[PDB]
Short mmCIF file of C-alpha atoms and ligand atoms in Angstrom, two decimals:
data_model
loop_
_atom_site.label_atom_id
_atom_site.label_comp_id
_atom_site.label_asym_id
_atom_site.label_seq_id
_atom_site.Cartn_x
_atom_site.Cartn_y
_atom_site.Cartn_z
CA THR A 1 9.65 46.46 -78.45
CA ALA A 2 7.28 44.31 -76.33
CA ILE A 3 8.27 42.56 -73.05
CA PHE A 4 8.38 38.72 -72.85
CA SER A 5 7.34 38.36 -69.14
CA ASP A 6 4.18 40.49 -69.76
CA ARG A 7 2.91 37.89 -72.33
CA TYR A 8 4.33 34.58 -70.92
CA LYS A 9 5.01 32.82 -67.58
CA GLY A 10 7.45 29.96 -66.88
CA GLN A 11 5.94 26.57 -65.92
CA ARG A 12 8.96 24.19 -65.82
CA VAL A 13 12.44 23.57 -67.32
CA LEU A 14 12.21 21.12 -70.27
CA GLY A 15 16.00 20.79 -70.76
CA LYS A 16 19.27 22.19 -72.18
CA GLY A 17 19.62 22.75 -75.94
CA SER A 18 22.08 24.48 -78.28
CA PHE A 19 22.80 28.17 -77.32
CA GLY A 20 20.49 28.05 -74.21
CA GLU A 21 17.93 26.50 -71.84
CA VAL A 22 14.40 25.60 -73.00
CA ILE A 23 11.55 26.62 -70.63
CA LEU A 24 7.93 25.41 -70.89
CA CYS A 25 6.03 28.72 -70.85
CA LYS A 26 2.30 29.46 -71.01
CA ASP A 27 0.45 32.50 -72.46
CA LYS A 28 -1.19 34.54 -69.65
CA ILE A 29 -4.44 35.10 -71.72
CA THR A 30 -5.00 32.27 -74.26
CA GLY A 31 -3.23 29.58 -72.16
CA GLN A 32 -1.23 28.25 -75.16
CA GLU A 33 1.82 26.19 -74.01
CA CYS A 34 5.14 27.05 -75.75
CA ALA A 35 8.81 25.90 -75.55
CA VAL A 36 10.94 29.07 -75.26
CA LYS A 37 14.72 28.85 -75.89
CA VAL A 38 16.46 31.52 -73.73
CA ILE A 39 19.83 32.53 -75.29
CA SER A 40 22.03 34.62 -72.92
CA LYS A 41 23.78 37.49 -74.81
CA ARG A 42 26.86 37.26 -72.50
CA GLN A 43 27.50 33.50 -72.97
CA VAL A 44 26.50 33.46 -76.73
CA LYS A 45 28.09 35.89 -79.25
CA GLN A 46 26.25 36.92 -82.45
CA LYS A 47 27.82 36.21 -85.88
CA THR A 48 25.48 38.69 -87.67
CA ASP A 49 23.98 42.16 -86.92
CA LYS A 50 20.50 42.87 -85.35
CA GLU A 51 18.77 43.73 -88.69
CA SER A 52 19.92 40.37 -90.24
CA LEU A 53 18.63 38.37 -87.21
CA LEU A 54 15.23 40.19 -87.25
CA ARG A 55 14.86 39.50 -91.02
CA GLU A 56 15.66 35.73 -90.66
CA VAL A 57 13.31 35.38 -87.63
CA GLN A 58 10.53 37.13 -89.65
CA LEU A 59 10.97 34.56 -92.49
CA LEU A 60 11.28 31.56 -90.06
CA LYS A 61 7.88 32.53 -88.47
CA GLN A 62 6.10 32.42 -91.88
CA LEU A 63 7.70 29.02 -92.77
CA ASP A 64 5.66 25.85 -92.09
CA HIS A 65 6.45 22.11 -92.61
CA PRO A 66 5.31 18.99 -90.62
CA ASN A 67 8.98 17.87 -90.11
CA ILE A 68 10.28 21.36 -89.01
CA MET A 69 9.72 23.07 -85.64
CA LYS A 70 7.18 25.94 -85.65
CA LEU A 71 8.41 29.36 -84.38
CA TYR A 72 5.65 31.72 -83.11
CA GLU A 73 7.30 34.83 -81.54
CA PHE A 74 10.65 36.54 -80.78
CA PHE A 75 11.63 38.92 -77.92
CA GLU A 76 14.84 40.68 -76.86
CA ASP A 77 16.01 42.64 -73.77
CA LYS A 78 19.41 44.03 -72.52
CA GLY A 79 20.96 40.56 -71.93
CA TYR A 80 18.67 37.86 -73.47
CA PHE A 81 16.89 36.55 -76.63
CA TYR A 82 13.58 34.62 -76.35
CA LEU A 83 12.80 32.30 -79.29
CA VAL A 84 9.16 31.16 -78.72
CA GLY A 85 8.06 27.94 -80.48
CA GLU A 86 5.90 24.78 -80.34
CA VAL A 87 6.27 22.08 -77.60
CA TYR A 88 7.03 18.42 -78.53
CA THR A 89 6.53 15.79 -75.77
CA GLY A 90 7.82 12.73 -77.72
CA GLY A 91 11.44 13.41 -76.72
CA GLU A 92 14.56 12.59 -78.76
CA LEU A 93 14.37 10.11 -81.69
CA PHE A 94 17.18 7.81 -80.37
CA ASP A 95 15.59 7.62 -76.85
CA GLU A 96 12.52 5.97 -78.52
CA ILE A 97 14.61 3.57 -80.73
CA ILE A 98 16.46 2.13 -77.64
CA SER A 99 13.09 1.30 -75.91
CA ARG A 100 11.47 -0.61 -78.87
CA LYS A 101 12.26 -4.33 -79.39
CA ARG A 102 12.41 -4.48 -83.25
CA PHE A 103 13.92 -1.95 -85.74
CA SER A 104 14.48 -2.51 -89.52
CA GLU A 105 15.36 -0.62 -92.77
CA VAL A 106 11.60 0.22 -93.18
CA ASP A 107 11.75 2.14 -89.84
CA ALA A 108 15.06 3.83 -90.85
CA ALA A 109 13.67 4.70 -94.34
CA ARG A 110 10.49 6.31 -92.90
CA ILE A 111 12.69 8.20 -90.33
CA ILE A 112 15.22 9.57 -92.90
CA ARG A 113 12.44 10.27 -95.53
CA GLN A 114 10.92 12.71 -92.97
CA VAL A 115 14.30 14.30 -92.11
CA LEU A 116 15.05 14.74 -95.86
CA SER A 117 11.53 16.22 -96.50
CA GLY A 118 12.22 18.79 -93.75
CA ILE A 119 15.74 19.58 -94.99
CA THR A 120 14.53 19.85 -98.65
CA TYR A 121 11.87 22.41 -97.60
CA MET A 122 14.36 24.52 -95.57
CA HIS A 123 16.92 24.40 -98.45
CA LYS A 124 14.37 25.87 -100.95
CA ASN A 125 13.91 28.85 -98.51
CA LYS A 126 17.80 29.33 -98.34
CA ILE A 127 18.11 28.18 -94.66
CA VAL A 128 20.91 25.82 -93.46
CA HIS A 129 21.14 23.82 -90.18
CA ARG A 130 24.97 23.15 -90.09
CA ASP A 131 24.74 21.33 -86.68
CA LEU A 132 22.18 18.61 -87.56
CA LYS A 133 22.43 15.63 -85.16
CA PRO A 134 20.11 13.05 -83.41
CA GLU A 135 19.73 15.44 -80.39
CA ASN A 136 17.88 17.91 -82.75
CA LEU A 137 15.46 15.17 -84.01
CA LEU A 138 12.53 15.44 -81.54
CA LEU A 139 9.30 13.41 -81.88
CA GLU A 140 6.03 15.46 -82.07
CA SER A 141 4.14 13.17 -79.59
CA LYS A 142 4.54 10.17 -77.21
CA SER A 143 2.80 7.84 -79.80
CA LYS A 144 5.00 5.43 -81.84
CA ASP A 145 3.57 6.63 -85.21
CA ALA A 146 4.54 10.32 -84.66
CA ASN A 147 6.20 12.87 -86.98
CA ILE A 148 9.87 13.90 -86.45
CA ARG A 149 10.38 17.67 -85.90
CA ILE A 150 13.89 19.10 -86.62
CA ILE A 151 14.92 21.87 -84.13
CA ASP A 152 17.51 24.76 -84.25
CA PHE A 153 17.32 25.44 -88.05
CA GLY A 154 19.26 28.62 -88.93
CA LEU A 155 20.58 29.38 -85.39
CA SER A 156 24.20 28.42 -86.26
CA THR A 157 24.21 31.14 -88.99
CA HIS A 158 23.33 33.92 -86.47
CA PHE A 159 24.97 32.61 -83.20
CA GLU A 160 28.60 31.56 -82.45
CA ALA A 161 29.06 27.91 -81.39
CA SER A 162 30.34 27.13 -77.87
CA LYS A 163 33.99 26.13 -77.21
CA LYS A 164 33.01 24.35 -73.92
CA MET A 165 33.07 20.51 -74.12
CA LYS A 166 29.75 20.23 -72.15
CA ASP A 167 28.06 21.97 -75.17
CA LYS A 168 30.10 20.11 -77.93
CA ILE A 169 29.22 16.48 -76.79
CA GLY A 170 28.68 14.28 -79.88
CA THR A 171 28.90 17.14 -82.43
CA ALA A 172 32.20 15.99 -84.09
CA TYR A 173 30.52 12.75 -85.38
CA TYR A 174 27.96 14.52 -87.64
CA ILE A 175 29.86 17.74 -88.61
CA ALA A 176 30.66 17.93 -92.37
CA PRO A 177 34.37 18.26 -93.43
CA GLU A 178 33.73 21.47 -95.43
CA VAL A 179 32.33 23.18 -92.25
CA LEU A 180 35.68 22.60 -90.45
CA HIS A 181 37.63 24.34 -93.29
CA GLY A 182 35.26 27.38 -93.56
CA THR A 183 33.79 27.07 -97.08
CA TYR A 184 30.39 25.32 -96.89
CA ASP A 185 26.81 25.46 -98.26
CA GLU A 186 23.45 23.61 -97.65
CA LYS A 187 25.05 20.23 -98.75
CA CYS A 188 26.60 19.92 -95.21
CA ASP A 189 23.08 18.87 -93.96
CA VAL A 190 23.05 15.88 -96.38
CA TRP A 191 26.39 14.64 -94.89
CA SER A 192 25.00 14.95 -91.33
CA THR A 193 21.82 13.03 -92.33
CA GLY A 194 24.10 10.47 -94.06
CA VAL A 195 25.99 9.95 -90.76
CA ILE A 196 22.63 9.57 -88.89
CA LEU A 197 21.44 7.00 -91.54
CA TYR A 198 24.80 5.15 -91.06
CA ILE A 199 24.25 4.95 -87.24
CA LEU A 200 20.54 3.92 -87.65
CA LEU A 201 21.53 0.81 -89.74
CA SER A 202 24.72 -0.14 -87.71
CA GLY A 203 24.74 1.70 -84.35
CA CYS A 204 28.43 2.69 -84.60
CA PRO A 205 29.46 6.09 -86.13
CA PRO A 206 31.30 5.93 -89.51
CA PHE A 207 33.95 8.44 -88.29
CA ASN A 208 34.73 7.28 -84.72
CA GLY A 209 37.53 8.00 -82.22
CA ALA A 210 38.72 7.92 -78.59
CA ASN A 211 38.51 11.78 -78.39
CA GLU A 212 37.12 14.90 -80.18
CA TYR A 213 40.29 15.61 -82.23
CA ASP A 214 40.58 11.88 -83.25
CA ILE A 215 36.93 11.94 -84.47
CA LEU A 216 37.52 15.19 -86.46
CA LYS A 217 40.73 13.63 -87.94
CA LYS A 218 38.67 10.74 -89.46
CA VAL A 219 35.95 13.17 -90.67
CA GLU A 220 38.53 15.50 -92.30
CA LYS A 221 40.15 12.49 -94.08
CA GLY A 222 36.61 11.42 -95.08
CA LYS A 223 37.32 7.65 -95.25
CA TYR A 224 34.81 5.08 -93.86
CA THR A 225 33.98 1.38 -94.53
CA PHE A 226 30.99 -0.99 -94.33
CA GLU A 227 33.32 -3.69 -92.82
CA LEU A 228 31.20 -4.87 -89.85
CA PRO A 229 28.97 -8.01 -89.48
CA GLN A 230 25.84 -5.80 -89.01
CA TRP A 231 26.21 -4.42 -92.64
CA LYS A 232 25.69 -7.97 -94.13
CA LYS A 233 21.91 -7.99 -93.30
CA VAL A 234 21.49 -4.45 -94.82
CA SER A 235 20.65 -3.98 -98.57
CA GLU A 236 23.03 -2.62 -101.27
CA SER A 237 20.70 0.35 -102.13
CA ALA A 238 20.92 1.52 -98.45
CA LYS A 239 24.74 1.57 -98.84
CA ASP A 240 24.49 3.35 -102.26
CA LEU A 241 22.47 6.20 -100.67
CA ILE A 242 25.04 6.41 -97.79
CA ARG A 243 27.91 6.47 -100.36
CA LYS A 244 26.14 9.33 -102.21
CA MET A 245 25.24 11.21 -98.95
CA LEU A 246 28.84 10.87 -97.59
CA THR A 247 30.62 12.06 -100.81
CA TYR A 248 33.55 14.29 -99.75
CA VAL A 249 33.22 16.96 -102.50
CA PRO A 250 29.90 18.84 -101.82
CA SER A 251 29.29 19.63 -105.55
CA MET A 252 29.44 15.85 -106.34
CA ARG A 253 27.32 15.04 -103.22
CA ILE A 254 23.58 14.33 -103.65
CA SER A 255 21.02 17.02 -102.74
CA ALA A 256 18.26 16.60 -100.11
CA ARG A 257 15.62 16.65 -102.92
CA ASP A 258 17.36 13.97 -105.07
CA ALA A 259 17.93 11.77 -101.94
CA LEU A 260 14.09 11.31 -101.61
CA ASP A 261 13.86 9.91 -105.20
CA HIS A 262 16.62 7.28 -104.42
CA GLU A 263 15.78 3.56 -104.96
CA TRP A 264 16.15 2.84 -101.18
CA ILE A 265 13.69 5.58 -100.06
CA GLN A 266 11.16 4.73 -102.85
CA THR A 267 11.24 0.92 -102.15
CA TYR A 268 11.24 0.84 -98.29
CA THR A 269 8.48 3.57 -97.83
CA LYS A 270 6.02 2.94 -100.73
CA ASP A 271 11.72 -9.05 -97.18
CA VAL A 272 12.43 -6.64 -94.25
CA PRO A 273 14.49 -8.35 -91.47
CA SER A 274 15.05 -6.81 -88.01
CA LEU A 275 18.48 -5.24 -87.29
CA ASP A 276 18.98 -6.61 -83.74
CA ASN A 277 22.77 -5.91 -83.59
CA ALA A 278 22.12 -2.23 -84.51
CA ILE A 279 19.60 -1.74 -81.61
CA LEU A 280 22.13 -3.00 -78.99
CA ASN A 281 24.85 -0.77 -80.55
CA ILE A 282 22.51 2.34 -80.58
CA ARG A 283 21.60 1.50 -76.92
CA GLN A 284 25.30 1.13 -75.96
CA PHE A 285 26.14 4.33 -77.93
CA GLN A 286 23.24 6.47 -76.59
CA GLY A 287 24.05 5.48 -72.99
CA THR A 288 27.76 6.37 -73.39
CA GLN A 289 26.87 9.84 -74.80
CA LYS A 290 24.30 10.64 -72.06
CA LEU A 291 26.65 9.55 -69.19
CA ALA A 292 29.58 11.57 -70.66
CA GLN A 293 27.20 14.58 -70.94
CA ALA A 294 25.83 14.12 -67.38
CA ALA A 295 29.43 13.84 -66.05
CA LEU A 296 30.36 17.24 -67.57
CA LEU A 297 27.05 18.91 -66.48
CA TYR A 298 27.58 17.52 -62.93
CA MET A 299 31.14 18.99 -62.82
CA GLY A 300 29.83 22.29 -64.26
CA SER A 301 26.96 22.45 -61.73
CA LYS A 302 29.34 21.89 -58.74
CA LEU A 303 31.63 24.79 -59.88
CA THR A 304 28.70 27.23 -60.40
CA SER A 305 27.11 26.02 -57.10
CA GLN A 306 30.33 26.72 -55.12
CA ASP A 307 30.68 30.10 -56.95
CA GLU A 308 27.04 31.05 -56.12
CA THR A 309 27.23 29.66 -52.50
CA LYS A 310 29.99 32.17 -51.56
CA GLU A 311 28.23 34.97 -53.57
CA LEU A 312 24.84 34.50 -51.80
CA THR A 313 26.65 34.28 -48.39
CA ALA A 314 28.51 37.59 -49.16
CA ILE A 315 25.18 39.32 -50.08
CA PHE A 316 23.41 38.10 -46.88
CA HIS A 317 26.52 39.06 -44.78
CA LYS A 318 26.19 42.75 -45.86
CA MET A 319 22.37 42.70 -45.33
CA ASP A 320 22.84 41.37 -41.72
CA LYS A 321 22.65 44.65 -39.72
CA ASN A 322 23.12 43.47 -36.08
CA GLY A 323 25.08 40.26 -36.90
CA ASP A 324 22.97 37.39 -35.43
CA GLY A 325 23.28 35.32 -38.65
CA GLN A 326 19.49 35.49 -39.34
CA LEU A 327 17.33 37.44 -41.83
CA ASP A 328 13.59 38.07 -42.49
CA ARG A 329 11.62 36.26 -45.27
CA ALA A 330 11.21 39.55 -47.23
CA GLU A 331 14.98 40.29 -46.89
CA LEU A 332 16.00 36.83 -48.28
CA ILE A 333 14.00 37.67 -51.48
CA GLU A 334 16.01 40.92 -51.98
CA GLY A 335 19.33 39.06 -51.58
CA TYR A 336 18.32 36.01 -53.70
CA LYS A 337 17.12 38.40 -56.49
CA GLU A 338 20.44 40.35 -56.15
CA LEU A 339 22.30 37.04 -56.84
CA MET A 340 20.18 36.56 -60.02
CA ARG A 341 20.63 40.26 -61.07
CA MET A 342 24.46 40.06 -60.70
CA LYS A 343 24.58 36.72 -62.62
CA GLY A 344 22.53 37.83 -65.65
CA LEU A 345 11.79 34.12 -65.33
CA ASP A 346 10.52 37.19 -63.38
CA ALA A 347 10.09 38.66 -59.82
CA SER A 348 6.99 36.45 -59.10
CA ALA A 349 8.95 33.23 -59.92
CA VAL A 350 11.95 34.50 -57.86
CA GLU A 351 9.64 35.16 -54.84
CA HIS A 352 8.05 31.68 -55.30
CA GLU A 353 11.51 29.99 -55.40
CA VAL A 354 12.44 31.64 -52.04
CA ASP A 355 9.10 30.43 -50.51
CA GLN A 356 9.84 26.86 -51.80
CA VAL A 357 13.17 26.87 -49.84
CA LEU A 358 11.66 28.48 -46.66
CA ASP A 359 8.87 25.80 -46.53
CA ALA A 360 11.61 23.13 -46.08
CA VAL A 361 14.10 25.37 -44.17
CA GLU A 362 19.72 31.15 -40.17
CA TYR A 363 20.60 32.39 -43.70
CA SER A 364 23.53 29.86 -43.87
CA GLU A 365 20.99 26.96 -43.82
CA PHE A 366 18.85 28.73 -46.51
CA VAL A 367 21.82 28.82 -48.97
CA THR A 368 22.63 25.10 -48.27
CA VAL A 369 19.06 24.03 -49.27
CA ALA A 370 18.65 26.62 -52.13
CA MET A 371 21.97 25.68 -53.82
CA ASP A 372 21.38 21.88 -53.40
CA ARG A 373 17.95 22.32 -55.14
CA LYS A 374 19.77 24.01 -58.10
CA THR A 375 22.07 20.92 -58.48
CA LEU A 376 19.22 18.37 -57.67
CA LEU A 377 18.63 17.87 -61.45
CA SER A 378 22.36 17.35 -62.32
CA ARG A 379 22.99 14.96 -59.33
CA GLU A 380 19.96 12.72 -60.14
CA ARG A 381 20.66 12.73 -63.94
CA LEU A 382 24.26 11.52 -63.27
CA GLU A 383 23.11 8.56 -61.14
CA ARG A 384 20.24 7.75 -63.56
CA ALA A 385 22.76 7.90 -66.48
CA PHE A 386 25.27 5.66 -64.63
CA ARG A 387 22.43 3.13 -63.92
CA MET A 388 21.31 3.16 -67.61
CA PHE A 389 24.94 2.85 -68.84
CA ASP A 390 25.40 -0.15 -66.48
CA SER A 391 23.01 -2.34 -68.57
CA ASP A 392 24.07 -5.64 -66.81
CA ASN A 393 23.33 -4.01 -63.35
CA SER A 394 26.72 -5.12 -61.93
CA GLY A 395 26.96 -1.76 -60.09
CA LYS A 396 30.47 -1.17 -61.51
CA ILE A 397 31.98 0.45 -64.64
CA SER A 398 35.25 -1.10 -66.01
CA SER A 399 38.47 0.82 -66.93
CA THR A 400 37.81 0.28 -70.69
CA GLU A 401 34.34 1.85 -70.21
CA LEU A 402 35.85 4.76 -68.13
CA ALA A 403 38.37 5.47 -70.93
CA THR A 404 35.43 5.58 -73.41
CA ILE A 405 33.36 7.89 -71.10
CA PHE A 406 36.32 10.19 -70.29
CA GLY A 407 37.40 9.97 -73.94
CA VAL A 408 34.03 11.36 -75.13
CA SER A 409 34.17 13.98 -72.26
CA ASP A 410 37.72 15.08 -73.43
CA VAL A 411 39.30 14.31 -70.01
CA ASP A 412 43.00 13.35 -70.57
CA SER A 413 43.86 9.65 -69.88
CA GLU A 414 46.70 10.53 -67.44
CA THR A 415 44.49 13.04 -65.52
CA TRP A 416 41.58 10.70 -64.55
CA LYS A 417 44.03 7.78 -63.83
CA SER A 418 45.88 9.99 -61.24
CA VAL A 419 42.46 10.97 -59.75
CA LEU A 420 41.33 7.26 -59.66
CA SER A 421 44.37 6.40 -57.45
CA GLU A 422 43.70 9.38 -55.10
CA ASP A 423 40.72 4.30 -54.50
CA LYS A 424 44.11 2.51 -53.91
CA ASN A 425 42.38 -0.97 -54.31
CA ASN A 426 43.43 -1.29 -58.04
CA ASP A 427 40.21 -3.27 -58.83
CA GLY A 428 40.10 -2.01 -62.45
CA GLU A 429 36.40 -1.08 -62.00
CA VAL A 430 34.52 1.67 -60.05
CA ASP A 431 31.04 1.97 -58.47
CA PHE A 432 28.79 5.11 -58.65
CA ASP A 433 30.20 6.70 -55.44
CA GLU A 434 33.80 6.11 -56.65
CA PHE A 435 32.89 7.47 -60.15
CA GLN A 436 31.20 10.53 -58.55
CA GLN A 437 34.26 11.08 -56.29
CA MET A 438 36.52 11.11 -59.43
CA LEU A 439 34.36 13.80 -61.12
CA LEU A 440 34.47 15.87 -57.86
CA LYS A 441 38.31 15.65 -57.78
CA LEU A 442 38.44 16.52 -61.55
CA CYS A 443 36.65 19.89 -60.81
CA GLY A 444 38.74 21.03 -57.80
CA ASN A 445 37.00 19.30 -54.84
C1 9YG B 1 16.12 20.47 -75.61
C2 9YG B 1 14.65 20.10 -75.39
C3 9YG B 1 14.45 18.62 -75.67
C4 9YG B 1 14.28 20.39 -73.94
N1 9YG B 1 13.77 20.90 -76.31
N2 9YG B 1 14.36 21.74 -77.24
C5 9YG B 1 13.42 22.24 -77.97
C6 9YG B 1 13.72 23.10 -79.16
C7 9YG B 1 13.35 24.55 -79.04
C8 9YG B 1 12.48 25.11 -78.15
N3 9YG B 1 12.34 26.45 -78.41
C9 9YG B 1 13.12 26.78 -79.49
C10 9YG B 1 13.27 27.99 -80.16
C11 9YG B 1 14.13 28.03 -81.25
C12 9YG B 1 14.80 26.89 -81.68
C13 9YG B 1 14.63 25.68 -81.01
C14 9YG B 1 13.78 25.61 -79.91
C15 9YG B 1 12.14 21.75 -77.54
C16 9YG B 1 10.77 21.87 -77.89
N4 9YG B 1 10.33 22.60 -78.91
N5 9YG B 1 9.86 21.17 -77.17
C17 9YG B 1 10.28 20.39 -76.17
N6 9YG B 1 11.54 20.19 -75.74
C18 9YG B 1 12.43 20.89 -76.46
#
C-alpha cells in the first residue's frame, strides 16, 4: 500500500464534515489541489469489512456526475483513512440563499432538479446517502449560476454514525422514519430531499421540535401540514411533489427518477413571485443551527485544550533535565510531536507549527500560545455566529432564543438556567461575554 504524505501535503483546514476533518491538500508533483477527508479509525468504527470498503471505493472512483462529488484516491495507515476528492469553493447551498435578496419556486426547482439528478444517478449504481442534508449540498464555485455537488455518498453504509451531539446537529430534521427503525432502502434519500424542498419553500422544517427526541417523535409519527401563511404564495404542484416525496411507506413513495418527471419540476425549469417570508425564515433557521453548532464545538475545544495543556506540560516536565523551566527549540519539536503521537499532516508540518509558536513566543509560555492557537478557530467562530444570530445588532440574545439554541444543542432547560444564575441581574437576556461564560460553566470551568 502507498503512503499518503509521500504524494500530498497539507495547505489549510477547510472545515469539519461527517466522520472527520477536511484538509486542503496539494499534490507534490502535479500541483493539483484536493479536499481530503481524514477519518480517524479510533473515533469512527467501521460497519463493514476492509474488502467491502475497498470494493465500494473502487466503484465510487469510476463514477462521474456533475451533481456528485468526484473521488480521486484512497489511502489507509494504522489509525487513519484518507478519502481524496475534488475541492468546491462555493460553500454550502443555504449560506448562499441567505445572502441573496430574491428567491422563488424557479430557484428551488432548479436546486432540487440538480439534487434529484445526482440522487437518481447514484441510485442506478446501487449507492445510498442515508444522511442527506443541506450541509452536504456544496456549490461547485463562488458564482451564482454554479452546479450543486452532493458530498458523503455511501459513507454511512461503511462507517458508524457518531453519538456525540456536536456531530448530530440538524440531522434529526432530514432523517427518514424507516432509517430509525432499521429496515430502509434508497427511498430514504427522496424523503430527505422532500424535507429540504419543504424548507426551501417555507424556511421552517416540516418535523420540528424543541429538542432532538421531540424532532424524531414528529418524524416517526410522519404527520406534517402546509398550515402557514408562507404556503399560500406557493403552487399546488409544489405541494403535490412534497406530499409524494414525504409518503410514509417507502414502497408507495416516489422514486428519484419519477420525481424529475413531476409537473412542478417540468414547469418551473423548462407567474413566479418571490418568497420573501421563506428567505427570512431560512436566515433565522441557518443562524440558529450555526450558533448551536459553534456553542458545542467551543465547549468541545475547551475540554480538549485543557486535556492537551496538562499533557504537553507533563511531557516537557520529563524532558527538563536540570529543572530551570526552559527547553531548546529542537527539544520542543520532540515533545510537541510526542503529544500528537500519543493523541493519534507529517513531521515537516509539525516542525513548522512549532516555529509558528516560537516566532510569537519558558516552555509554560509556549503551551499557552500553542493551545490558544488550536482554539483560535472555535473562539472566533462562536463570536461570529453570535453576531450573525443577533440580526438586529442589539448585542443581546433573549431567553426564548437561548431555549431554542440550547434546545438544538440538547442542553437540558434546568441545567443552563442554573448556570445563567451563577448573572444574578435577572434581565431575561444575555450578551456575548455572558453567553460565553455560560458555555464555559456548562463544560466544567
Ligand atoms: C466540510 C467542508 C465544507 C469543509 N468540505 N467537505 C467536503 C467534502 C469532502 C472532502 N473530501 C471528501 C472525501 C469523501 C467524501 C466527502 C469529502 C469538501 C470539499 N470537497 N471541498 C471543500 N470543502 C469541503
